[PDB]
Design a binder for this molecule. Structure first.
Ligand SMILES: [Mg+2]
Ligand SMILES: [Mg+2]
Lengths: 114, 518, 165, 182
C-alpha cells in the first residue's frame, strides 16, 4: 500500500443543520441548550512517537539530527498544538468541514509527455 | 499679604511603584496616548495632576466632607476662603539609568467572537517602574502646628496608598514616598522671616509627628493569588522577532528586565469571566451588541468600571461612567535578565546558532543549554496543507515559550470604600458584588480562566496554589473574608459566610436590578 | 539669527524644535492625503479593492520602524528589509508596488531624502545660527517615523473607501 | 452689558451687509432688496471684546475664514428674483439650522463629539491639512455627506469670493443656542 490515501471531501452545497455552515455560538454566555466543560483524555502510544526539538537539532555535512523535545520536568513534552492539529484534521474529515489549510494551488501543475 | 503663622516645606522622593502615565493632550505618532512633557520636553508630573491626587485622597479620607478640605486646598466660592494653602510644584521625572519610556500595547477583545474588536487597538507610553520625582509641597499655616489631616496625607504617601495618573485600575500609577523632610519657617517673626531669606529653615523630626497619629487606612480587600504556569504563560511582544517570531513581553524594573503580564491583561480575563457568569445567569446574549455595549452589564459596571458617557436619561442629565473599584497590578517574573542580556535574545538570528548563546546567558545557565531550555524553550510550528500534507507554503513559525519562568503572586486590590460609595453606603448591597468576585476566583483556581497569548494553542493555563484574602477595616459582616484559601472551591471560607453570600447572590439573581440605583 | 555664543541659544533651540515638529506633523498629514504621493514616497497603491502590499505587510514594516530612534538604528530597518528581500514568497508580496522595497531602503538609508519629500521651507521655523543643519540631524528619525505613520494611515482610510464600494 | 451691547452694535453692522450684496435687479442707484439677516457671537471670554480681534482670530490663513456668520433668514423663495440670490443661498440660516440638527441628531450620536472635535482642530490648519483630516473620516460617518460643502463630499470648505469659508464651526458653536419652546 502506498503509505498515504485520501478521505473524500464531498461538496457541501445545500447542507443544513449543524453540519452546515452556520453562525458560531460565540463566547458571550453559556447557551442553555449547548454543552460546555472539561473532558479528560488519555493518549497512549502504539508505535513509537517522534517529538523532534528543532531548537536543539545538530547539523553535520548538512544532515540534521534531532533529539526528543523535553519539558521542564525532563519528561517528553508533547505539544498541545500537535494534538490539536491531529484532532482538527481528524475532526474535519469525519464531520466533512471545509479544509482549514489549502495553500494557493492556483498554478497549473506540470507533467512530461511520454 | 495673607497672614502666615508658619510656612512648611515638605519634600522628599516619590518613586513609581508601578509604571506611570500622566497624559498630555494626546497622540504623538509613536503612540496613541502620549506622556505629559514640560516646556523643555522633560517628562514631569504636573502639580495640577499631583495636587488633585492628594486632594482626592483627603476627600475620600474626610468622607467627602467639603468643609475641612476647602480649608487646606482653598476654594473659589466661599467669601472667606479663596486661594489654596497647600502649594504643589511641577516635578520632573528622572527615569532610571539606561531605562527609557516603554510602549504598552492594548487591545479590546470582542466578547462574542473572542477576538480583537475592530478599532480597539491602542498603545500607551509609560514611565517605567522605579522612576523618581521630587515631592514638592509647601504649606502656609495660619494656625499653630500642622493639620492632622495633612499628617495623615503624608502617612498615606509613605504607605503608598495614593495613585497618580491614568489607568489606575489596570496596572499603572502607584507611587510611594521616601526620604520625607520637613522644614519649618516661622514667617510670623523676625527670626523666622530672615530664616526664610538666609538660613534655610528649621528641621522637624517626622518620626515625632508620625508618633502622634494612627494611620487610618480605608476599607479594602487585598487578594494575592499564588500561581505557576501549567502551560507556558506569556503575553506576546509588540512585534515579530528575527530568530523567533513570537517573543514574550518584558519590562524594565530597575537594573533588570523581567517578563511581565500587565494588569490590563489580568483585569481583562477576569472581567470577561465575570460578564460571562452574569450573562449566563440571565441568559442575555452578547452577539448583537457592539463592543462598547457588550462591556456594559450589571455588577461589573461597579467592580470593573464603566466608560464615561453622559446621558439625558430622564430630562435629568447623568453620567454612566464610574471608575473600577477593582484594580490589578502588573505581574513580573521571578527570573530577571540584564537589559543587554535580553537585547541579545531579541537580536538573535539563527535559532540553532547565535540564539543558543543568548538564551544560555539569559536563562542563567551560560554553559548548560539543556537547563537553559527548561526555562525558555524555542518551539517550531507548521501549518500542514490538507490535501498534500507536508507544510503549507510560507506557514512556518516559531515561539519562544517561557515554559519554566516562575511568576510572583498576582495582586488584586478591591476598594470596598469605592463600592460602598456607589451603593450609597448600604453594605447589604456588597454581597452580590463580593459573591461575583468569589465566583470569578473559583474559576481562576479551576483552570477555567487561561491567561495571555495562545490560550487555545498550547499556552496560558495556570495552577493556583493559594489565594490570600487580606482586607483592612472590612465591615463586620464581611470580616470572615480575611483568610488564606488553598481549596479551589472556596471551602476555606466559613460555610455560614459562603451560605450568606449565596443567599444575597441568589436574591439578586431573582431580580438583577442595577444595584447602585438608589 | 541668534549668535552662536548667545546665552539664550539653548532656549531658542527648545522653541525651534517645537515649531519644526508641528510643521513636520502638518506636512505629513497633507502628503498622506493624496494617493499619488503615498505611491511616490513608499510605492504603496490601491488597485480595485486590493491593497499593495496587504495592510498586514505595511503593518509589519511599521512595527520595525518604531525601533528607528536614531540614524544609528537604521541598521535595524535595513536588516529587516534584507531578510524580507531574501525570502522569495515575501519579496513577491511587494511586487505590484511601485518599487516599494527600494523606496523604503532609500528613505531609511539616504539621510537627505526625508527632507526632500516633506519639502518644508524651514527658514521661518529657525532662529539659531546653524539651526537648520543641527535640527535636521536631530529630528531626522522622527520625521521618517512621522511621514511613514501618516502615509500608512492615509492609505488604510482610502482603502476602506475602495473596499466599501 | 455696556460691552456686550457694543458688540451687538458691531454684529448688526455685519448682518446689515446684506444691504449691499443682495439688491433689486437693475435698480440705480442700486437699492438693497428686502432681506433679513442675523449675526451672532457667543462670547466665552472675560475681557477683550473687539469684533476685529474676535473675527480675525478665527480667520487663521489668508485664504481661509472659519465663519459664514452673516446669515440670511429670509425664505429662499422671496429672494429668488434679486441679484445676489446664489450668495443668499450659501448664507441661508436654514443651512446652519439644518447642520445643527445633524449634530444634535441621534441611541447614540450620529456624528460623535469625539470626531467633531477632531475636525474642529484641523480647521485651524491649512486647508490642505483640513481636507486631509476630513478624508480620514468622511466615509466612516455617513452623516458627513451633509456637512460637506465642496460638491464632492471631500471638504468642509466651499469657495466664496476667492476665500475658503465653512459653516461647520458655526454649527458647533451655535449647537446649543437653537432651542425653542415650539
Ligand atoms: Mg492616535
Ligand atoms: Mg526568520
Amino acid at each position: 500500500h502506498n503509505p498515504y490515501n485520501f478521505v473524500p471531501a464531498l461538496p457541501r452545497d445545500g447542507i443544513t443543520g449543524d453540519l452546515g455552515d452556520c453562525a458560531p455560538a460565540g463566547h458571550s454566555y453559556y447557551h442553555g441548550d449547548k454543552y460546555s466543560g472539561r473532558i479528560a483524555v488519555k493518549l497512549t502510544t502504539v508505535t513509537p512517537l517522534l517529538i523532534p526539538d528543532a531548537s536543539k537539532e545538530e547539523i553535520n555535512n548538512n544532515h540534521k539530527t534531532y533529539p526528543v523535545r523535553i519539558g521542564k520536568d525532563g519528561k517528553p513534552y508533547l505539544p498541545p498544538t500537535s494534538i490539536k492539529g491531529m484532532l482538527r484534521s481528524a475532526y474535519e474529515a469525519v464531520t466533512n468541514s471545509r479544509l482549514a489549510v489549502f495553500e494557493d494551488h492556483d498554478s497549473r501543475l506540470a507533467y512530461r509527455m511520454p | 499679604a495673607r497672614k502666615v503663622t508658619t510656612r512648611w516645606k515638605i519634600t522628599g522622593t516619590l518613586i513609581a511603584e508601578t509604571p506611570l502615565h500622566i497624559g498630555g493632550v494626546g497622540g504623538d505618532a509613536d503612540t496613541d496616548l502620549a506622556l505629559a512633557v514640560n516646556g523643555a520636553g522633560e517628562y514631569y508630573v504636573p502639580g495640577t495632576s499631583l495636587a488633585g491626587a492628594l486632594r482626592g485622597w483627603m476627600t475620600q479620607l474626610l468622607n467627602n466632607d467639603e468643609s475641612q478640605i476647602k480649608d487646606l486646598w482653598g476654594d473659589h466660592l466661599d467669601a472667606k476662603r479663596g486661594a489654596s494653602f497647600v502649594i504643589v510644584d511641577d516635578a520632573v521625572i528622572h527615569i532610571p539609568n539606561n531605562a527609557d519610556v516603554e510602549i504598552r500595547e492594548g487591545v479590546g477583545i470582542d466578547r462574542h467572537f473572542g477576538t480583537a474588536a475592530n478599532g480597539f487597538k491602542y498603545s500607551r507610553a509609560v514611565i517605567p517602574k522605579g522612576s523618581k520625582f521630587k515631592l514638592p509641597l509647601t504649606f502656609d499655616s495660619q494656625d499653630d502646628g500642622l493639620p492632622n489631616a495633612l499628617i495623615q496625607l503624608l502617612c498615606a504617601l509613605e504607605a503608598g496608598d495614593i495613585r497618580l495618573g491614568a489607568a489606575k485600575t489596570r496596572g499603572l500609577g502607584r507611587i510611594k514616598l521616601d526620604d520625607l523632610k520637613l522644614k519649618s519657617f516661622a514667617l510670623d517673626k523676625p527670626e523666622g522671616i530672615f530664616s526664610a531669606l538666609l538660613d534655610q529653615g528649621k528641621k522637624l523630626d517626622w518620626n515625632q509627628l508620625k508618633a502622634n497619629v494612627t494611620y487610618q487606612s480605608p476599607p479594602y480587600l487585598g487578594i494575592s493569588i499564588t500561581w505557576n504556569p501549567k502551560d507556558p504563560v506569556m503575553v506576546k511582544a509588540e512585534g515579530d522577532g528575527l530568530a523567533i517570531d513570537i517573543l514574550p513581553l518584558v519590562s524594565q524594573v530597575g537594573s533588570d528586565v523581567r517578563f511581565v503580564i500587565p494588569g490590563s491583561s489580568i483585569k481583562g480575563i477576569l472581567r470577561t469571566q465575570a460578564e460571562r457568569i452574569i450573562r449566563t445567569i440571565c441568559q442575555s446574549n452578547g452577539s448583537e451588541k457592539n463592543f462598547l455595549e457588550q462591556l456594559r452589564i450589571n455588577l461589573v459596571n461597579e467592580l470593573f468600571g464603566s466608560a464615561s458617557l453622559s446621558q439625558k436619561q430622564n430630562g435629568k442629565d447623568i453620567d454612566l461612567g464610574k471608575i473600577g473599584a477593582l484594580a490589578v497590578n502588573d505581574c513580573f517574573s521571578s527570573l530577571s535578565m540584564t537589559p543587554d542580556q535580553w537585547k541579545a535574545v531579541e537580536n538573535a538570528t539563527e535559532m540553532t546558532g547565535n540564539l543558543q548563546p543568548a538564551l544560555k546567558q539569559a536563562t542563567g545557565y551560560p554553559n548548560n543549554i539543556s537547563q537553559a531550555y527548561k526555562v525558555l524553550q524555542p518551539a517550531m510550528h507548521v501549518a500542514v496543507d490538507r490535501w498534500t500534507g507536508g507544510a503549507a507554503e510560507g506557514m512556518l513559525y516559531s515561539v519562544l515559550e517561557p515554559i519554566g519562568v516562575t511568576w510572583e503572586p498576582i495582586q488584586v486590590h478591591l476598594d470596598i470604600a469605592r463600592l460602598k460609595n456607589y451603593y450609597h453606603g448600604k453594605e447589604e448591597k456588597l454581597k452580590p458584588a463580593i459573591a461575583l468576585l468569589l465566583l470569578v476566583l473559583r474559576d481562576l483556581a479551576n483552570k477555567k480562566i487561561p491567561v495571555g497569548y495562545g490560550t487555545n494553542r498550547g499556552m496560558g493555563t495556570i495552577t493556583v496554589s493559594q489565594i490570600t484574602l487580606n482586607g483592612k477595616a472590612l465591615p463586620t459582616e464581611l470580616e470572615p473574608l480575611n483568610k488564606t484559601m488553598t481549596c479551589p472551591n472556596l471551602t476555606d471560607l466559613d460555610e455560614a459566610f459562603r451560605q450568606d453570600l449565596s443567599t444575597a447572590w441568589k436574591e439578586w439573581i431573582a431580580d438583577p436590578i442595577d444595584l447602585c440605583q438608589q | 539669527p541668534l549668535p552662536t555664543n548667545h546665552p539664550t541659544q539653548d532656549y531658542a533651540r527648545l522653541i525651534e524644535k517645537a515649531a519644526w515638529r508641528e510643521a513636520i506633523q502638518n506636512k505629513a498629514l497633507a502628503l498622506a492625503s493624496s494617493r499619488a504621493k503615498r505611491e511616490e514616497i513608499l510605492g504603496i497603491k490601491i488597485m480595485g479593492k486590493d491593497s499593495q502590499p496587504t495592510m498586514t505587510q505595511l503593518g509589519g514594516f511599521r512595527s520595525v520602524l518604531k525601533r528607528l530612534h536614531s540614524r544609528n538604528n537604521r541598521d535595524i530597518v535595513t536588516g529587516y528589509l534584507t531578510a524580507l528581500e531574501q525570502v522569495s514568497n515575501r519579496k513577491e508580496k511587494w511586487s505590484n508596488t511601485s518599487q516599494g522595497l527600494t523606496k523604503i531602503r532609500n528613505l531609511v538609508t539616504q539621510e537627505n531624502l526625508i527632507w526632500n519629500h516633506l519639502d518644508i521651507d524651514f527658514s521661518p521655523l529657525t532662529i539659531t545660527q546653524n539651526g537648520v543643519n543641527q535640527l535636521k540631524s536631530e529630528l531626522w528619525a522622527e520625521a521618517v517615523r512621522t511621514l511613514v505613520d501618516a502615509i500608512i494611515r492615509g492609505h488604510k482610510r482610502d482603502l476602506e473607501k475602495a473596499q466599501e464600494n | 452689558f455696556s460691552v456686550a451691547y457694543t458688540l451687538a452694535e458691531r454684529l448688526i453692522k455685519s448682518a446689515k451687509e446684506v444691504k449691499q450684496k443682495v439688491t433689486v435687479t437693475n435698480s440705480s442707484p442700486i437699492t438693497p432688496f428686502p432681506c433679513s439677516a442675523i449675526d451672532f457671537h457667543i462670547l466665552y471670554d472675560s475681557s477683550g471684546i473687539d469684533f476685529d480681534r474676535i473675527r480675525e482670530k478665527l480667520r487663521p490663513e489668508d485664504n481661509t475664514e472659519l465663519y459664514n456668520r452673516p446669515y440670511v433668514v429670509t425664505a429662499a423663495e422671496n429672494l429668488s428674483q434679486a441679484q445676489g440670490y446664489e450668495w443668499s443661498q450659501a448664507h441661508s440660516l436654514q443651512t446652519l439650522a439644518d447642520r445643527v440638527s445633524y449634530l444634535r441628531s441621534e441611541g447614540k450620536s450620529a456624528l460623535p463629539s469625539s470626531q467633531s472635535h477632531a475636525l474642529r482642530t484641523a480647521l485651524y490648519l491649512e486647508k490642505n491639512e483640513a481636507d486631509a483630516q476630513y478624508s480620514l473620516i468622511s466615509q466612516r460617518y455617513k452623516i458627513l455627506k451633509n456637512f460637506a460643502e465642496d460638491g464632492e463630499n471631500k471638504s468642509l470648505f466651499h469657495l466664496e469670493n476667492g476665500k475658503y469659508v465653512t459653516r461647520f464651526l458655526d454649527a458647533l458653536d451655535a449647537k446649543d443656542f437653537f432651542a425653542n419652546a415650539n
